[PDB]
Design a protein around this motif. Structure first.
Motif, PDB file in Angstrom:
ATOM      1  N   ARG B 309     -57.624 -91.332  -0.714  1.00  0.00           N
ATOM      2  CA  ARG B 309     -56.445 -90.742   0.126  1.00  0.00           C
ATOM      3  C   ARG B 309     -56.849 -89.138   0.528  1.00  0.00           C
ATOM      4  O   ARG B 309     -57.492 -88.307  -0.112  1.00  0.00           O
ATOM      5  CB  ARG B 309     -55.442 -90.584  -0.797  1.00  0.00           C
ATOM      6  CG  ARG B 309     -54.013 -89.828  -0.061  1.00  0.00           C
ATOM      7  CD  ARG B 309     -52.808 -90.347  -0.741  1.00  0.00           C
ATOM      8  NE  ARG B 309     -53.173 -89.624  -2.207  1.00  0.00           N
ATOM      9  CZ  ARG B 309     -53.301 -90.539  -3.151  1.00  0.00           C
ATOM     10  NH1 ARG B 309     -53.078 -91.928  -3.011  1.00  0.00           N
ATOM     11  NH2 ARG B 309     -53.173 -89.904  -4.406  1.00  0.00           N
ATOM     12  N   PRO B 314     -53.824 -87.960   5.400  1.00  0.00           N
ATOM     13  CA  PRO B 314     -53.968 -89.079   4.782  1.00  0.00           C
ATOM     14  C   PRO B 314     -53.756 -90.211   5.900  1.00  0.00           C
ATOM     15  O   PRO B 314     -54.356 -91.440   5.457  1.00  0.00           O
ATOM     16  CB  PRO B 314     -52.992 -89.176   3.893  1.00  0.00           C
ATOM     17  CG  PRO B 314     -51.916 -87.885   4.414  1.00  0.00           C
ATOM     18  CD  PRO B 314     -52.673 -87.041   5.053  1.00  0.00           C
ATOM     19  N   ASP B 315     -53.020 -90.049   6.959  1.00  0.00           N
ATOM     20  CA  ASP B 315     -52.760 -91.156   7.914  1.00  0.00           C
ATOM     21  C   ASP B 315     -54.023 -91.028   8.925  1.00  0.00           C
ATOM     22  O   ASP B 315     -53.726 -91.631   9.961  1.00  0.00           O
ATOM     23  CB  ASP B 315     -51.561 -90.890   8.561  1.00  0.00           C
ATOM     24  CG  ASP B 315     -51.670 -89.511   9.430  1.00  0.00           C
ATOM     25  OD1 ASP B 315     -52.302 -88.668   9.421  1.00  0.00           O
ATOM     26  OD2 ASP B 315     -50.522 -89.372  10.350  1.00  0.00           O
ATOM     27  N   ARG B 316     -55.199 -90.520   8.667  1.00  0.00           N
ATOM     28  CA  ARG B 316     -56.340 -90.710   9.613  1.00  0.00           C
ATOM     29  C   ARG B 316     -57.414 -91.309   8.742  1.00  0.00           C
ATOM     30  O   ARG B 316     -57.668 -90.825   7.739  1.00  0.00           O
ATOM     31  CB  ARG B 316     -56.729 -89.195  10.053  1.00  0.00           C
ATOM     32  CG  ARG B 316     -55.770 -88.793  11.293  1.00  0.00           C
ATOM     33  CD  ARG B 316     -55.860 -89.479  12.064  1.00  0.00           C
ATOM     34  NE  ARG B 316     -54.789 -89.101  13.349  1.00  0.00           N
ATOM     35  CZ  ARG B 316     -53.569 -89.717  13.553  1.00  0.00           C
ATOM     36  NH1 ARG B 316     -53.145 -90.675  12.684  1.00  0.00           N
ATOM     37  NH2 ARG B 316     -52.888 -89.410  14.630  1.00  0.00           N
ATOM     38  N   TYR B 317     -58.048 -92.502   9.328  1.00  0.00           N
ATOM     39  CA  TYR B 317     -58.927 -93.403   8.530  1.00  0.00           C
ATOM     40  C   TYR B 317     -60.302 -93.195   8.998  1.00  0.00           C
ATOM     41  O   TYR B 317     -60.526 -93.736  10.228  1.00  0.00           O
ATOM     42  CB  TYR B 317     -58.601 -94.583   8.452  1.00  0.00           C
ATOM     43  CG  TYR B 317     -56.996 -94.990   8.008  1.00  0.00           C
ATOM     44  CD1 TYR B 317     -56.271 -94.363   7.103  1.00  0.00           C
ATOM     45  CD2 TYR B 317     -56.364 -95.987   8.322  1.00  0.00           C
ATOM     46  CE1 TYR B 317     -55.185 -94.765   6.668  1.00  0.00           C
ATOM     47  CE2 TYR B 317     -55.087 -96.363   8.151  1.00  0.00           C
ATOM     48  CZ  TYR B 317     -54.664 -95.616   7.237  1.00  0.00           C
ATOM     49  OH  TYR B 317     -53.104 -96.046   6.893  1.00  0.00           O
ATOM     50  N   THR B 361     -58.518 -89.656   5.072  1.00  0.00           N
ATOM     51  CA  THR B 361     -58.591 -90.801   4.277  1.00  0.00           C
ATOM     52  C   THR B 361     -59.830 -91.475   4.677  1.00  0.00           C
ATOM     53  O   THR B 361     -60.242 -91.774   5.714  1.00  0.00           O
ATOM     54  CB  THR B 361     -57.363 -91.777   4.233  1.00  0.00           C
ATOM     55  OG1 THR B 361     -56.278 -91.100   3.625  1.00  0.00           O
ATOM     56  CG2 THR B 361     -57.505 -93.052   3.612  1.00  0.00           C
ATOM     57  N   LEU B 387     -52.240-100.489  12.135  1.00  0.00           N
ATOM     58  CA  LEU B 387     -52.567 -99.117  11.303  1.00  0.00           C
ATOM     59  C   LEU B 387     -53.920 -98.740  12.214  1.00  0.00           C
ATOM     60  O   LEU B 387     -54.256 -97.461  12.161  1.00  0.00           O
ATOM     61  CB  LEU B 387     -52.674 -99.531  10.158  1.00  0.00           C
ATOM     62  CG  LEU B 387     -51.604-100.292   9.340  1.00  0.00           C
ATOM     63  CD1 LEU B 387     -51.917-100.527   7.482  1.00  0.00           C
ATOM     64  CD2 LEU B 387     -50.393 -99.637   9.828  1.00  0.00           C
ATOM     65  N   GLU B 390     -53.739 -97.005  15.757  1.00  0.00           N
ATOM     66  CA  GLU B 390     -52.816 -95.581  15.569  1.00  0.00           C
ATOM     67  C   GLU B 390     -53.767 -94.765  14.839  1.00  0.00           C
ATOM     68  O   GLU B 390     -53.317 -93.679  14.912  1.00  0.00           O
ATOM     69  CB  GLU B 390     -51.637 -95.827  15.591  1.00  0.00           C
ATOM     70  CG  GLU B 390     -50.685 -96.846  16.355  1.00  0.00           C
ATOM     71  CD  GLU B 390     -51.117 -96.657  17.831  1.00  0.00           C
ATOM     72  OE1 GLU B 390     -51.702 -95.769  18.381  1.00  0.00           O
ATOM     73  OE2 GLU B 390     -50.424 -97.427  18.475  1.00  0.00           O
ATOM     74  N   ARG B 391     -54.466 -94.940  13.737  1.00  0.00           N
ATOM     75  CA  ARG B 391     -54.887 -94.291  12.742  1.00  0.00           C
ATOM     76  C   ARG B 391     -56.387 -94.310  12.495  1.00  0.00           C
ATOM     77  O   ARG B 391     -56.851 -93.391  11.896  1.00  0.00           O
ATOM     78  CB  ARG B 391     -54.155 -94.562  11.585  1.00  0.00           C
ATOM     79  CG  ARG B 391     -52.676 -94.350  11.393  1.00  0.00           C
ATOM     80  CD  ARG B 391     -52.172 -94.839  10.064  1.00  0.00           C
ATOM     81  NE  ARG B 391     -50.629 -95.043  10.080  1.00  0.00           N
ATOM     82  CZ  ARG B 391     -50.041 -95.705   9.181  1.00  0.00           C
ATOM     83  NH1 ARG B 391     -50.551 -95.955   7.985  1.00  0.00           N
ATOM     84  NH2 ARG B 391     -48.670 -95.872   9.420  1.00  0.00           N
TER      85      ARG B 391
END
Ligand SMILES: *[C@@H]1O[C@H](CO)[C@@H](O[C@@H]2O[C@H](CO)[C@@H](O[C@@H]3O[C@H](CO)[C@@H](O)[C@H](O[C@H]4O[C@H](CO)[C@@H](O)[C@H](O)[C@@H]4O)[C@@H]3O)[C@H](O)[C@H]2NC(C)=O)[C@H](O)[C@H]1NC(C)=O
Ligand SMILES: *[C@@H]1O[C@H](CO)[C@@H](O[C@@H]2O[C@H](CO)[C@@H](O[C@@H]3O[C@H](CO)[C@@H](O)[C@H](O[C@H]4O[C@H](CO)[C@@H](O)[C@H](O)[C@@H]4O)[C@@H]3O)[C@H](O)[C@H]2NC(C)=O)[C@H](O)[C@H]1NC(C)=O
Ligand SMILES: *[C@@H]1O[C@H](CO)[C@@H](O[C@@H]2O[C@H](CO)[C@@H](O[C@@H]3O[C@H](CO)[C@@H](O)[C@H](O)[C@@H]3O)[C@H](O)[C@H]2NC(C)=O)[C@H](O)[C@H]1NC(C)=O
Ligand SMILES: *[C@@H]1O[C@H](CO)[C@@H](O[C@@H]2O[C@H](CO)[C@@H](O[C@@H]3O[C@H](CO)[C@@H](O)[C@H](O)[C@@H]3O)[C@H](O)[C@H]2NC(C)=O)[C@H](O)[C@H]1NC(C)=O
Ligand SMILES: *[C@@H]1O[C@H](CO)[C@@H](O[C@@H]2O[C@H](CO)[C@@H](O)[C@H](O)[C@H]2NC(C)=O)[C@H](O)[C@H]1NC(C)=O
Ligand SMILES: *[C@@H]1O[C@H](CO)[C@@H](O[C@@H]2O[C@H](CO)[C@@H](O)[C@H](O)[C@H]2NC(C)=O)[C@H](O)[C@H]1NC(C)=O
Ligand SMILES: *[C@@H]1O[C@H](CO)[C@@H](O[C@@H]2O[C@H](CO)[C@@H](O)[C@H](O)[C@H]2NC(C)=O)[C@H](O)[C@H]1NC(C)=O
Ligand SMILES: *[C@@H]1O[C@H](CO)[C@@H](O[C@@H]2O[C@H](CO)[C@@H](O)[C@H](O)[C@H]2NC(C)=O)[C@H](O)[C@H]1NC(C)=O
Ligand SMILES: *[C@@H]1O[C@H](CO)[C@@H](O)[C@H](O)[C@H]1NC(C)=O
Ligand SMILES: *[C@@H]1O[C@H](CO)[C@@H](O)[C@H](O)[C@H]1NC(C)=O
Ligand SMILES: *[C@@H]1O[C@H](CO)[C@@H](O)[C@H](O)[C@H]1NC(C)=O
Ligand SMILES: *[C@@H]1O[C@H](CO)[C@@H](O)[C@H](O)[C@H]1NC(C)=O
Ligand SMILES: *[C@@H]1O[C@H](CO)[C@@H](O)[C@H](O)[C@H]1NC(C)=O
Ligand SMILES: *[C@@H]1O[C@H](CO)[C@@H](O)[C@H](O)[C@H]1NC(C)=O
Ligand SMILES: [Ca+2]
Ligand SMILES: [Ca+2]
Ligand SMILES: [Cl-]
Ligand SMILES: [Cl-]
Ligand SMILES: [Zn+2]
Ligand SMILES: [Zn+2]
Ligand SMILES: [Zn+2]
Ligand SMILES: [Zn+2]
Lengths: 696, 696
Positions: B309, B314-317, B361, B387, B390-391
């Motif tokens: 994480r 955290p919402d970017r992978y 993340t 997911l 968008e991420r």
């Protein structure tokens, strides 16, 4: 303070009235010089009103116009070929406009040319169930016949598609007083009813979300490659023409063949409503002949796009859009909406001139060519689809502000239910008898929700307006609001003067809203929604409201399927996965709501994360593969009904797989496809739920 | 300090060696118990190594296996029907593994069953141009013939598709020593060459990005609705089987009919390479008979998904993924890559245990069923597509770490060119002769860019690996890196022991990388890229590098078209719109770069805005309608070549519209489609440029 109150108090009834008058003195038909002039005017005014930029976005799209030197009309023709009766070449113009030029005569936009001659069949509203009854129960065959259908109940493009598939060679549409003349009210100019010479214009396409017929998927810009006419999307293959009820009486009075099958097939004219085919014995040898010479032509259209840049999140867009093109004067459709948008822009620009800016960017649009198939909004969205799908928070539509004077009407995504409830509790009711009461209170009283009690009715979005590309193609949360009639105590369709030359400034000022108080209320609802969307720190969407409606729609579609218990057994048709997904959605949405309540309010990345989860929740219901044979309807929960573009259908993929399934010749294949659509819907619901889970 | 140096210094050659040995003692064929065991092991270790969560994601997908009691083989059969020669039932196992069980014998995954008998045609590499030469120039007809083709040059699935369309009734694939035996090197176990009994396994699908053949568009989860076999995606219609060159010599030595058309058709076996059809006079009456009995079966597969994480976003992978399933022992493919990923996870987890977390993340994946059509990666991405789109910041692939010992190979999006240049300047070259020099220096010297000089070669992404769903379907910036051979001084294909039982731990430790220094260098390149992507405040993408390559690809596709100047005149075929869009992209990208340099570095929303513009730039090249007849190839700039899945093609839609266009019978229609694809490409380029404009 620069708050929503400051914004709302700046809105004036008297300004909306001035703008309505200004916008309705001459026709503004799409593709005409007058409508380009009005675009330039709105562009200049929105600049003066204070927006940061205001540009025209133009496209070259397929439009349709009658031939001014070769008029459209329909005849009764005798055995020798003499035309013994002709329908009108124009609507009698209203008082004081009898010298306005460039009033387009009644026609059906996009009709092919032809002069078909034949016997009439009367098909009631030309609904799917009307043709079922004719063909299956009455054994009447429409092949090679001219059909006559009354307007009402469903979008006219679906009537024409249904006649075409029944093998008709032409369609005549008319306005029955049963559906367009309210008892006890006088005809225009003396009241708001449709006169017998009045006729409803409108296009008859079946675009299914494509936009310009020649450029599906891409903007109709300067270098666009266009399909040939034969491969164009959505064009009818048979000639079509609309008439008023004076003329319709003359075509219907001689009808023979079968009696109407029951009273739901009879309108209010003094004729029997026989279905045909053809005329009674004495006239059995007379026929009906259409003469259609309209042409389709690629034509430039112009949208006005105004921007008010956000102070904090300029890359997040809240869009207020409605069209500007009209069939004639557009007194209600669309200028009662355009005038409301103009006053909203003015109010926002007032605040801006004093130093305020909304949190997020607000985009204002004056769309063109809506009447010809939502062309302006759709081509612009095709051009800007990447910006809209990564940045689009919400779209609020702004077509006609009124279709009655009884109560509010709101159709929107469940994500806006709470926002609408809360805003309307803070607005004053304009209704007589509710002086000093909230709009919420009057609305809930006059339009009770079927489900809830103590709550107002809010309808799902259908289509037939410019939100379609934003909502059903792109998955941006959308809503619309207007004042409407009491549908209970009224049997007629929409409002009677719809798309007629009689829809004027006078109609509105004299009969619908002389004080402009319903217009003002609608400007407050639309503008208040845009304000809260563009300014609230947390986006004002409640995911839990989607969870409640998803359960209602799952119950409904399961109930439909369960009319076929034997087949559900034979083919092992289970809705368990869909109910599971809806249960999970409900649980995850409840937990997300708690975090949204409890998150550390000082952390803006946490805030931007949770705002993105809110923004992309509507987006998650998009399937990039689209619905079957309708690639531009990509939302899995809502599509326009396949039988009526104006109505929304829920779980449309499963709905259409089940529709009329007992008639399919390969039941194994048919129920296989039902199961496929259940899998797609359950999957999409679970995937949308998971966008609300913790991100990592 | 916890910086990239700390991460890079923790990586150890000796650990990669230990993991490689651990992963290559038994076969790990997708769908088998041994490969589920290994998944469980990796899951447990990644947990111990410190990741926040580590889960198995399973799917039930179509796999293919030989029948263990009914073996596949090919015969020469005489006039009586006696089988006078049979191909091998298995590869001789290498030293010390002759008692390993569950080595799958050579087969072509997804071949249908059959026992076709007929005359051979030899089709060289079964490339599109090989069939053109046979059919158009040599007038040889393959209809109802068994074709024999040498492996190499193009993906084997394209060979089978091309034979099938030529009307073949079966395909025999074999490894020619011209393409799989390097001069002067000994056969395994004594060197790295393919022995005459060695055979290359591999699937022969044409999935075009679909993933599981039975569930295109949706994850193959527990409630999935599956297509029937007859409607499955990508399955071959004719039986196919691979053999080694001992066996191939026996099938080829008797060939008659036409001579090979030239020397590019001759491999290195002591046979004439006659094309046929059939055998020379003495044997004209013998035939070839295949016996294929493999079965396709829905089978569970397992991906391991680890999460670290992000502290701030955290919402970017940032995703590091490579597969775990192997054909047999997977000494190079894939375990030399999996061991590198395992050590990267370990290094990251070390830092995490001391309190560090990356900015964004990081997701780590051990994919299953890659060898059967990229099934594991693709089904997971179908499940999580909302997911990811968008991420998803970036995807770095991690299949084989080595295919040679000469220099670095990188294939990636232009958006990563600068990141790769900068990282490799900070890494030590492992090459002899470049002690104390940078990896950039040795790489640029041994693999000079064709265009630039002082710069290294970086190839476009093709396909045939697990980045395909992320890059060409979803539009997430992707890259891969490994050590490779010198392609100049070597004529052979990939590495010789590819997908053979001889690809073992010993092959690697003895002949490719005994010190594990090339593995370590590759772990530094892959891990260094993931580090910078997940940790840099501004994402490390340079949009200006896309502008440079878009001009190169526009020049290239225009040059192709200009081989047809008469038709470009007749049909008014202009590339002006595409060059205009590329010019605008270059201008806008230059301005965006300036703002990125000059923006207020204290403003995180400005920072998140500009990072989102960077993240969604690859995304902007996606067309939701896909390329013609290939709906899952949606990137407009890059698709796998329609003639060779392994190779990338630029402006693929225009490329395929132009390919072989002089042979089309309706030139008006063909050049119309060229113009359509130019419009689509120019539009997409301009739309992607506009995502880099100021947002409002
Ligand atoms: C709603 O959310 C819940 C999670 O809270 C989610 O539950 C998941 O359900 C699937 C079933 O569709 C479970 O899948 C199982 O996974 C186990 C391994 O964990 C497998 O062994 C199972 O397959 C075998 O065993 C089954 C017996 O239970 C057999 O029926 C099957 O044929 C195989 O032999 C099976 O695949 C999954 O474990 C849970 N996940 C949880 C609890 O975390 C549910 O799927 C969500 N709904 C939707 C529509 O997504
Ligand atoms: C690259 O970026 C540039 C912007 O810097 C952008 O230029 C735009 O080009 C289009 C042409 O495709 C221009 O479109 C014109 O717009 C005017 C109104 O502004 C119209 O009147 C024009 O149409 C009429 O006149 C033309 C003569 O110029 C005729 O050829 C035509 O048939 C009509 O009579 C025309 O539509 C547009 O104005 C500019 N925009 C600018 C300069 O801001 C270019 O399009 C970009 N490239 C791509 C591939 O998008
Ligand atoms: C519409 O208005 C209602 C009523 O104001 C809004 O619901 C209310 O939202 C507030 C503000 O977040 C909630 O406050 C929270 O209360 C909990 C206490 O349990 C506390 O932990 C939080 O810190 C916060 O104070 C409030 O409970 C809630 N009221 C109800 C009945 O839900 C609603 O959010 C508005 N809708 C929209 C879209 O704005
Ligand atoms: C790869 O490394 C190169 C070289 O370090 C990076 O380019 C450099 O990036 C820096 C940091 O932003 C640029 O600095 C800027 O300089 C201007 C002065 O004109 C100043 O206004 C800014 O405040 C900032 O200091 C530097 O100019 C630039 N050097 C070159 C030759 O471009 C590049 O960004 C790295 N690439 C990646 C993906 O990290
Ligand atoms: C609608 O209102 C606009 C704006 O007041 C009028 O257009 C203005 O007309 C004046 C007087 O002719 C000109 O000097 C202005 O330049 C115009 N302004 C703009 C922005 O166009 C228009 O005449 C009104 N139309 C009607 C029918 O009342
Ligand atoms: C209906 O309109 C048609 C067409 O205008 C009329 O028929 C025409 O009459 C003119 C003048 O007498 C003739 O010269 C044309 O040859 C006729 N054309 C056709 C196509 O028939 C017809 O008279 C009108 N009928 C009525 C009742 O007004
Ligand atoms: C590969 O390495 C793993 C991990 O060290 C070995 O699995 C362990 O085996 C020991 C001894 O049998 C057990 O007590 C552990 O529980 C296992 N750990 C895990 C995480 O599975 C495995 O045996 C090695 N395999 C080979 C072929 O060397
Ligand atoms: C190739 O293999 C085939 C099949 O095993 C052999 O032919 C079989 O021989 C057995 C034993 O003599 C017979 O009982 C079977 O009836 C034969 N089957 C078929 C399908 O022909 C053949 O002998 C082998 N040829 C060589 C050269 O080894
Ligand atoms: C309209 O009709 C006239 C005369 O009847 C004809 O000359 C012209 O071709 C038609 N115009 C169009 C645009 O089709
Ligand atoms: C309807 O009429 C057409 C035209 O003659 C005929 O071909 C068709 O079969 C008929 N269908 C039925 C159901 O009677
Ligand atoms: C306005 O409201 C009155 C009172 O209910 C009603 O009688 C009248 O029909 C309304 N006018 C319109 C156009 O609906
Ligand atoms: C494999 O072949 C054997 C015997 O020749 C047969 O009994 C069985 O049906 C086949 N197995 C499968 C999975 O097709
Ligand atoms: C190739 O052979 C088949 C099979 O007999 C035949 O039908 C086909 O037309 C042939 N094509 C050519 C170009 O000779
Ligand atoms: C390793 O490098 C040496 C020196 O260039 C070369 O001769 C040998 O072929 C290489 N081994 C492999 C497997 O490529
Ligand atoms: Ca279009
Ligand atoms: Ca799938
Ligand atoms: Cl509206
Ligand atoms: Cl790789
Ligand atoms: Zn309207
Ligand atoms: Zn309208
Ligand atoms: Zn591999
Ligand atoms: Zn492989």
């Amino acid at each position: 303070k620069h708050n929503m109150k400051a914004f709302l108090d700046e809105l004036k009834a008297e300004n909306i009235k001035k703008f309505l008058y200004n916008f309705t003195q001459i026709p503004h038909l799409a593709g005409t010089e007058q409508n380009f002039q009005l675009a330039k005017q709105i562009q200049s005014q929105w600049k003066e009103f204070g927006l940061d930029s205001v540009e025209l976005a133009h496209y070259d799209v397929l439009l349709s116009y009658p031939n001014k030197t070769h008029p459209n009309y329909i005849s009764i023709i005798n055995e020798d070929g003499n035309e013994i009766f002709n329908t009108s070449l124009f609507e009698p113009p209203p008082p004081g406009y009898e010298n306005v030029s460039d009033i387009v005569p009644p026609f059906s936009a996009f009709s092919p040319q032809g002069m078909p001659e034949g016997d009439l069949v009367y098909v009631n509203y030309a609904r799917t169930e009307d043709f079922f009854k004719l063909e299956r129960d009455m054994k009447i065959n429409c092949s090679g016949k001219i059909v006559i259908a009354r307007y009402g109940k469903v979008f006219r493009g679906n009537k024409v598609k249904n006649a075409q598939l029944a093998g008709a060679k032409g369609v005549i549409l008319y306005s029955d007083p049963a559906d367009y003349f309210a008892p006890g009210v006088k005809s225009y100019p003396d009241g708001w009813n449709l006169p017998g010479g009045g006729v409803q214009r409108g296009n008859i396409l079946n675009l299914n979300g494509a936009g310009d017929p020649l450029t599906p998927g891409y903007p109709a810009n300067e270098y666009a490659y266009r399909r040939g006419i034969a491969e164009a999307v959505g064009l009818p293959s048979i000639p079509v023409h609309p008439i008023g009820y004076y003329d319709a009486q003359k075509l219907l009075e001689k009808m023979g063949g079968s009696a109407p099958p029951d009273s739901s097939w009879r309108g209010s004219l003094k004729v029997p409503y026989n279905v045909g085919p053809g005329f009674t014995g004495n006239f059995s040898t007379q026929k009906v002949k259409m003469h259609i010479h309209s042409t389709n032509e690629v034509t430039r259209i112009y949208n006005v796009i105004g921007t008010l840049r956000g102070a904090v999140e300029p890359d997040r867009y809240v869009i207020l859009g409605g069209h500007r093109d009209s069939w004639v004067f557009g007194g209600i459709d669309p200028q009662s909406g355009a005038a409301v948008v103009h006053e909203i822009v003015r109010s926002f620009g007032t605040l801006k001139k004093e130093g305020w800016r909304p949190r997020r960017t607000i985009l204002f649009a004056s769309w063109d060519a809506e009447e010809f198939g939502l062309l302006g909004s759709t081509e612009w969205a095709e051009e800007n689809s990447r910006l809209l799908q990564e940045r689009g928070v919400a779209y609020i539509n702004a077509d006609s502000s009124i279709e009655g004077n009884y109560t509010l009407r709101v159709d929107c995504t469940p994500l806006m239910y709470s926002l609408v409830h809360n805003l309307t509790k803070e607005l004053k009711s304009p209704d007589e008898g509710f002086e000093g009461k909230s709009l919420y209170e009057s609305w809930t009283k006059k339009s009770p929700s079927p489900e809830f009690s103590g709550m107002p009715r809010i309808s799902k979005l259908g289509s037939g307006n410019d939100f379609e590309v934003f909502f059903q193609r792109l998955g941006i949360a959308s809503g619309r609001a207007r004042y409407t009639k009491n549908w209970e105590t009224n049997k007629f369709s929409g409002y009677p003067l719809y798309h007629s030359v009689y829809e004027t400034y006078e109609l509105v000022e004299k009969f619908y809203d002389p004080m402009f108080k319903y217009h003002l209320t609608v400007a407050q609802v639309r503008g208040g929604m845009v304000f809260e969307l563009a300014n609230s720190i947390v986006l004002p969407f409640d995911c839990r409201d989607y969870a409640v409606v998803l359960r209602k729609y799952a119950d409904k579609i399961y109930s439909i399927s369960m009319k076929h218990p034997q087949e559900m057994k034979t083919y092992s048709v289970s809705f368990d996965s869909l109910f599971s997904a809806v249960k999970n959605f409900t649980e995850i949405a409840s937990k997300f709501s708690e975090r949204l309540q409890d998150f550390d309010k000082s952390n803006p990345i946490v805030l931007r994360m949770m705002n993105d989860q809110l923004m992309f929740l509507e987006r998650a219901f998009i399937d990039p593969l689209g619905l079957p044979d309708r690639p531009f309807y990509r939302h899995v929960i809502y599509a326009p009904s396949s039988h009526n573009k104006y109505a929304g259908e829920s779980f449309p993929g499963i709905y259409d797989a089940l529709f009329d399934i007992e008639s399919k010749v390969d039941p194994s294949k048919a129920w296989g496809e039902v199961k496929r659509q259940i899998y797609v819907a359950a999957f999409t619901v679970q995937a949308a739920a998971e966008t609300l889970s913790e991100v990592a």
